Amino acid sequence: YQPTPEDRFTFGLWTVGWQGRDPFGDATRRALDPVESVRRLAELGAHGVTFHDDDLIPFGSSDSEREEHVKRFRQALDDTGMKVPMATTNLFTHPVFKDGGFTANDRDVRRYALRKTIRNIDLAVELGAETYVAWGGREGAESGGAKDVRDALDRMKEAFDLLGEYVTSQGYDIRFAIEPKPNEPRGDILLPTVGHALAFIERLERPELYGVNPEVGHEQMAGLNFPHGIAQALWAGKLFHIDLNGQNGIKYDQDLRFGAGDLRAAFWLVDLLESAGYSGPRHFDFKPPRTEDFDGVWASAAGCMRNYLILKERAAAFRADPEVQEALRASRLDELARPTAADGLQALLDDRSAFEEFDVDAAAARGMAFERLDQLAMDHLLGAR
Amino acid sequence: YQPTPEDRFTFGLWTVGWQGRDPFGDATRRALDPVESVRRLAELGAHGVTFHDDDLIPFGSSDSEREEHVKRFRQALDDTGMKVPMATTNLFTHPVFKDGGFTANDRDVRRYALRKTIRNIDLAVELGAETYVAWGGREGAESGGAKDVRDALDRMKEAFDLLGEYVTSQGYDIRFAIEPKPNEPRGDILLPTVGHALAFIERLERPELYGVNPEVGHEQMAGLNFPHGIAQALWAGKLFHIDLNGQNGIKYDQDLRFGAGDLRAAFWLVDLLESAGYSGPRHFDFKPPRTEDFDGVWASAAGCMRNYLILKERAAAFRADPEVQEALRASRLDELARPTAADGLQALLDDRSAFEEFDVDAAAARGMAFERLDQLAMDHLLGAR
């Protein structure tokens, strides 16, 4: 189960670089130089890395310092052959963003947020990124009177429209991906799920430029089924990128390594990406627990990849098994893929077998054979066939 | 706090008519004749009622029995002056719908579901309904292999497209409202939230015919903020109807009377509907608890209306208070309503006060004064000014 750069596994600098500060605790690990992370990731078999502006260039850096930071990073990429398929902006750490970036009540702040974003879009293109993520972690509220949501959506639309005008005018080959999260750090965050983000995109001036970047843990903090949310993004043609990690139910965002948390949901996600022919990066947005030292960080990162490869194998074996193919037919998955009324409205209306003469009791008596199918799925996942 | 028919309060037959059967218990109350419910509701000050096909005409009724059921109902409406602004279909009780209506794996079932729906659309128009609700309570799964979500969305789209073709061809003045719910009775239900339903509508052939019917308790079963979800529906121009009730967090769907459950969320919802000028029905989809007799049912129904009227009064007093208007200015709600960059992209890019010369520390130091505003909101809700 050895990964190679062909598996397209990526990691954010902020993941293996998390120092372990939490709401109740100081850091347990020293900071990692981005160059070191690049090298260690390459040795593990990763394909590339991602970054927030602030991960690469310390906030408030002079143009001189900025150039120096970039050059060193670029050298590491050249030395290892690692790519940079996505980048994003930090619009959440600094105190100025306490009420949001694009939807802060203060107009001056909103203008600042757009300028900080545009500067990073330029760098991202320079580095070859294909996707630019936006997670509005501070857009929301803890109380009802603080934010008029209709006005905030107007402000969010305005912001994304200006970014689309910008890339268009420059002639850049980059697309945007919005990342939803229901809460934390705000009481409630705007665009809380994959559905809310998809619905919002349809109101932008150039909808073709925007998709979603769903994250496992995020949809599970609302108790939603991740594989179902991803199927809806695929159906809309909007899965531009994906964030993989683990989460144990509805609580604070844990960011465990991928495979931990809900294992069966991880299995069904892998089955789907692989069946659907998803060809984007398999990005891990996780945090090695603060209990670990450096050895532990690398082990956790390696486990992310290992878990994906084991699941891939098990899902493939599941779909290729003749006995499973037979069970899918038994459960009428074939019939779900056929049109209900290709014959049209009129033909449906005139068809007595559809109502007048339909034997409802006979249809009701037919078992779905879902439990036998699910048990074959479990046997496959566990290597117990 | 007396309601009148002008307040536009409505109730489903199934609400005051719930006999009290739950997953672990038999009925505690006898069935109510629809005619009796109409009369009792009129006396309490309700404006109208709503129904599923099966609430009005017992499943499997002959055409003769059907006509008889309708005529009696129509007489009650005439006697009391009650209206019927919405109707819907039961595609969840009968065993034939065990795997869904529009997205059942069996094709024969899907065809049956559409025929049963079309028959009720005809009645709804006859009775003067303006809105037709669709809650797909059985569309979903308990296991991953049972439903290919991409195929199910194809099937759901096909179903809604055929219904749109139908109303168009007949020349009916009726619009559709999709009602999301995250789970129960299925393990996971498709289109689980207000966002997922809004995103789906944008892919239908004639999107103008469809909106949402959000329900308080439903979004709270996913731990989402209801007033925020409603603001997004308002922003999209898609709030065609609304279901009001109460819920105590993430658990089974309780369906308490409106006002019970999350009281502060009820306050913010009322403030919003009233501020936004929502002119549709205020419908209560709730269940008087099984502990109650008939006297208790009517008391609970009366409480739904009473609670809305008290909240309306308190929200109005909140918005009209000079001291609140001053606090909103202090918290920069005025600034949130102004465009970020009406000056345009170029002007933003050339504005040094937006980046180069922006004093981030001075901006960061500005308190939002949100807690004083929230305390004025609490004082108002409690009548403690």
Add this chain to the structure above:
Amino acid sequence: YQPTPEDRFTFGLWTVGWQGRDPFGDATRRALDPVESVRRLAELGAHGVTFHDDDLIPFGSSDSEREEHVKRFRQALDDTGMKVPMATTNLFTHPVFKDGGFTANDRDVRRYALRKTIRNIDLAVELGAETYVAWGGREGAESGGAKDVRDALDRMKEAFDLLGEYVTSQGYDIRFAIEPKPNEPRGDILLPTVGHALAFIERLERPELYGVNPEVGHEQMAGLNFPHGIAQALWAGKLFHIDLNGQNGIKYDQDLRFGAGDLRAAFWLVDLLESAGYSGPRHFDFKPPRTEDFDGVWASAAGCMRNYLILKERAAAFRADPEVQEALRASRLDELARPTAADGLQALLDDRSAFEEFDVDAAAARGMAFERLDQLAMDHLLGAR
């Protein structure tokens, strides 16, 4: 992975016998005669069955009918060699129990509840049951004013004390097990978790007679860690029985087959029961989904047992692996089992290496190596060593 009666697997009559009625739907399956369930379970390899009074003898049965029902059941047991290790009372279905059994506000009801319970204790002993379960599904409330919890606990204590006096006086060899659940069917249920039930037992007149019957899904409806709750019951010497099934997070109680829901939590539960030497019944309290016919019911029941046996194998392989034993030492599990201060209070107070000279930074720098250990656990579960 074939079960035999030696594995001690048991099922309630109500599990494979669930007809599929839910809050929104009618039954999908016909009722099963208890004799048929006994025979089918024996053929699958089960060790025994359990029952509520009402599952075996229809409510309101004459003494004549009662005897007839028992005799037929007894014949089935003799024919198959199945045992009856536990029984319980139905104090939740009939409308009289709408406000509870032992804690109903009406005193007459409370007296009735105790009489119905005592009659079943007698039968249970006759059939050879060793454990009597009590799940107070209707003890609780939907509103704050309806129940004074202090008075209700007095009433609950009184009830359990009288039952203890009863078994003592009769000389029966039976112990009681209280089963907690947080909600459903009441808004909140009293004694909502394993901890609340353990704390309550310590206030009864003869605490030795009572333990807990925890259920997987129940603790997961509160988002708690089941294996941790079971370890606390084991530590107190109070795990008298256990209910196994599956649950997908915080929502309505699903009652999936064991192994479904949280698979990793199922793995850790098996590891614990097996390590601790739990020698009681492995009882399955689950519901085959309403989508299934009879073939599906038996397949789901078979899957419960299969899943336990696979997990048992994987946990055993995990604990026996030399490389795991080494990792446990690396993570200081050995040190957690040694007393902190067997030397005593004074020796601790005088030990400078414990404070004055303790090198906090050196201790802080030591990684716990938890992620490598967890990855070995995952590899083992998946059969990927």
Add this chain to the structure above:
Amino acid sequence: YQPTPEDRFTFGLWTVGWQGRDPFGDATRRALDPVESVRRLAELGAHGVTFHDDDLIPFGSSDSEREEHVKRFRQALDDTGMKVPMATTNLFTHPVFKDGGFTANDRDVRRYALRKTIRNIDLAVELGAETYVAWGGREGAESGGAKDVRDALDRMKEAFDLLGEYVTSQGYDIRFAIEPKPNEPRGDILLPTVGHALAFIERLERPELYGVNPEVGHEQMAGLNFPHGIAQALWAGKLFHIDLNGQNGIKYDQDLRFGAGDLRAAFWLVDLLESAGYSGPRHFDFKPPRTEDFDGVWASAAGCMRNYLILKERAAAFRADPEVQEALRASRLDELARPTAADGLQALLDDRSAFEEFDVDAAAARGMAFERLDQLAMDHLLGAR
């Protein structure tokens, strides 16, 4: 609604002193000197303050610096007349506690944790504290193999036993209060709820010395009913202290001001404390949101007290209303307070009216009149009588 020192309102230094650092953000406010907090709290009408060792004396302080810190604090208390009714230990911030204090795997750490605790017990007594709280925020795990819960409970018991031996030997007049929390910062924390802590106390060598310190938000992060948990602590005679704040459901711990979050649950809590004659401190463990400046901190602190006083008034009016007293009788609250069988076991067994002649249908038909009672409760809370 003006508080006075007689209302017994207290605050932790860490509450109004929270700088606003979260998992995703830097501090938004400067640190407050403990002397300033004491003075500002006194002016608002607070009765006293509480502290962790580390809030008062910076970690790693010399004995010289320690004495200086104490003296300054003592002067502030004398100047204002504020008291210190409770103190606690910080066993969670420093990296050495990454795996816990009392239950860390490393034995050396466990010994250190006890020494740090004993030093603070001494100071607490010097300052006049009556209660010593213990919140084991780092005792728990993120993975199943990392902690053997049976061994950890042995370790936790050992720790509390040694602390009891210590206070006993010194002759101190102080009692311990254990504070449960389900998760955050660990994946799962040991003793997750009020029930688990109550059950654990019963296994300590001198159970009389220990009680619980429940916190509103903590039990709500598991979706439990706080007023019910408090009634069980009252019933056991174990409510030694209480932490008041607000929380919006199952998510990260928000720590809103008291009254925010679940308002109806706040009403029922106040009704209970006041009815039961709770005479301990009304302590606020909350965090003014990071959006606020200093003015906002004081406003939020003032709101905590204001909200309690308004609720107190409304609960008192509720209980004193003749119409409510009549409704309570209608709902049989009087009957819940009478013994079920003061006549005894034998008399119950011989009473035909309890079974043989009990009219179950007549009893079942009796409505509980809970909704009318709940509506009177709502009317009272809202000042709408």
